[PDB]
Design an enzyme around this catalytic site. Sequence first.
Site, PDB file in Angstrom:
ATOM      1  N   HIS B 221     -51.295  -5.978  40.367  1.00  0.00           N
ATOM      2  CA  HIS B 221     -50.511  -6.023  41.593  1.00  0.00           C
ATOM      3  C   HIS B 221     -49.297  -6.926  41.436  1.00  0.00           C
ATOM      4  CE1 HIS B 221     -53.678  -3.710  43.123  1.00  0.00           C
ATOM      5  NE2 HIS B 221     -54.441  -4.659  43.636  1.00  0.00           N
ATOM      6  N   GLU B 225     -45.349  -5.462  41.419  1.00  0.00           N
ATOM      7  CA  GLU B 225     -44.327  -5.870  42.375  1.00  0.00           C
ATOM      8  C   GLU B 225     -43.083  -6.388  41.665  1.00  0.00           C
ATOM      9  OE1 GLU B 225     -44.046  -5.287  45.386  1.00  0.00           O
ATOM     10  OE2 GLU B 225     -42.334  -6.538  45.932  1.00  0.00           O
ATOM     11  N   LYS B 228     -40.942  -3.557  40.329  1.00  0.00           N
ATOM     12  CA  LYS B 228     -40.273  -2.786  41.370  1.00  0.00           C
ATOM     13  C   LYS B 228     -38.980  -3.458  41.805  1.00  0.00           C
ATOM     14  CE  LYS B 228     -43.884  -2.330  44.103  1.00  0.00           C
ATOM     15  NZ  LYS B 228     -44.663  -1.972  45.327  1.00  0.00           N
ATOM     16  N   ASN B 229     -38.969  -4.786  41.854  1.00  0.00           N
ATOM     17  CA  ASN B 229     -37.748  -5.497  42.208  1.00  0.00           C
ATOM     18  C   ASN B 229     -36.797  -5.617  41.028  1.00  0.00           C
ATOM     19  OD1 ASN B 229     -38.504  -6.106  44.948  1.00  0.00           O
ATOM     20  ND2 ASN B 229     -39.980  -7.551  44.067  1.00  0.00           N
TER      21      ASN B 229
END
EC number: 2.7.11.2
Lengths: 337, 336
Positions: B221, B225, B228-229
């Site tokens: 997780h 994340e 993705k950024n």
Amino acid sequence: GSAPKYIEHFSKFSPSPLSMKQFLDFGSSNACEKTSFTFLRQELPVRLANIMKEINLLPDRVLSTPSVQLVQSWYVQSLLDIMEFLDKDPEDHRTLSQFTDALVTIRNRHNDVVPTMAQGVLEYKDTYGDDPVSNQNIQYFLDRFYLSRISIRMLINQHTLIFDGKHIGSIDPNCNVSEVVKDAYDMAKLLCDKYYMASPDLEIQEINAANSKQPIHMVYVPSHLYHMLFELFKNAMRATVESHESSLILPPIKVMVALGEEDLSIKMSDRGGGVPLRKIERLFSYMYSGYGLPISRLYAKYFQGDLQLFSMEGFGTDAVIYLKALSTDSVERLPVY
Amino acid sequence: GSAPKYIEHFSKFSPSPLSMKQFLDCEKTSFTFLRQELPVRLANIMKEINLLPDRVLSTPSVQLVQSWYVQSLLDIMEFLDKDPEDHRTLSQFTDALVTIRNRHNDVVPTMAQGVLEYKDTYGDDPVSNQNIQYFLDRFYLSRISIRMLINQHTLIFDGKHIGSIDPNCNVSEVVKDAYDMAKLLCDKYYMASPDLEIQEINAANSKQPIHMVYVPSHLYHMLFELFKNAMRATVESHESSLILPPIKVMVALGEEDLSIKMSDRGGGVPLRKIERLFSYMYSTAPLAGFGYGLPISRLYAKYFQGDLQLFSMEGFGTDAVIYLKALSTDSVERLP
Ligand SMILES: COC(=O)c1cc2c(nc1C)[nH]c1c(C3CC3)cccc12
Ligand SMILES: COC(=O)c1cc2c(nc1C)[nH]c1c(C3CC3)cccc12
Ligand SMILES: [Cl-]
């Protein structure tokens, strides 16, 4: 001989932070000597009395030590020294010349302040212990005290250097950041080759976002940036050399200078084996540390900047100096009283 | 009608943080342990929920989540006097935990809705920001602690891989999994994606594969994340340019710390905006958005004495480091 009333009166006055633009108009010409005198005779006792009041509010176990009594005696003498010019006439050039000598003598008393304060901390560790709560209280005051010291000595240096007879005193409006990086490296290299039998090589990579490959320049105090970058080089070279002692290859200390719309960041990366995250906080603690690093961070914060450290144990360490790119955003960061 | 009474008794007990070694260390044992520990961890957070001001405590989201926590608390108390040796008792216990887990699935969007209600109802003041940050850091971390116990019990006791914990967790394998997922999402929306570069630095054992004892689902997780950024910033910054610079990753294994640096070149960020990336309120608004799952990502790291930090250089790129304890001895639950 009325310092307690002088401290109470001027403690009510708040300090007056200044931007980079204001420093230049003062140093724009020698004719502004009277305006600087009328301002500094008022503002200096305000910054002194504010920290001096904070010094007196300390507990007596700290306040009663000989180290603290000595520094407080210096602040009182310099406070009373500056107050003799409050009643004088700025139109008399002799009044202006006498003020500079006073400021130059004020600095000479406070030359050995940082070593003196380091003694009181070591005395505290052996007399009262080095507990987490003691570190937070010592970190809180010394950051504010030294930040006040940086701000006060900043004002004095601008007047003595400008009004002596490209660089506006201690400020360089065309400060080449890469040159200051190279100068700080050269000094660390000289100390490194004398202490060790090798020195890491330097690599610089500028990143001007809006004007790629154009040289990055700013408005800043290069003496401050030298102090920060020089203390970082000594740490990067010490760990890099001592980590590769059994190795032949000595990795270079790569540096990057990125110029963004707001930030002017200066990363310095080594390969000195890095540090565990548990000990990163210890490097900035006055009590647990050897104050070049926390003082370097104060120089960064002093103009709304910052200095941060992040490491990778087993590999190396990275250190980034954050500076405000715009002279508008470069404004004095003083302790809140 | 004794829900406040039940909260008082178990709130007196402090939660007992567990080590990774303890998690590795039988349904009767976990049955007897959890019936005491679960209501203690529920009661402590439910206590702090009532400590909130009348502005927040009176909101429907807070009272809604309280109804789940109250109902979840009462479900555990039936098993206090039951027989651990009875297979029906143990099975009902395992069945009882799954419904509580599924009951609390919509807590994050429910809590995220409450923050938006507060932003529009009372404004974005600094004092409430620190309190919401202080409270949500503790509430969400409590949710992770409870789910970790529930997942370890329900998965172990079904009737080499210890539930959610992989003793030989190859870190670079989880990095590839999170990247490949984020890449497909990047390819779907942007029709392009940066390439990945991985390096490993095993200090104590050069060339040895970097393995550890960790929960890969929690590790997936966090890396998911961050990619993705990183992919959005790299893509959006180079939208007019042709080449997308790669997203580089390094995995260092020290004597005590296991660090994971990720680096992009998405044009970096000013230092002032780094705070709002970790703030629930400022990330809350009316691949993933810049700073969406990032507050909770930092909590997953600290759950076992870790941390997550961001360092950006405006005009160039951004770095992100995940600090983890290398040894299971030092891997212990950070409980509120
Ligand atoms: C336990 O402190 C240490 O031993 C230690 C400290 C530092 C280091 N490497 C080691 C092993 N690199 C450093 C750097 C460089 C520019 C990135 C700066 C400040 C301290 C360190
Ligand atoms: C307004 O925040 C932004 O726009 C923003 C946010 C991030 C970014 N770059 C930009 C321009 N890289 C990020 C990374 C990568 C691994 C180093 C992680 C999390 C957020 C960001
Ligand atoms: Cl929950």
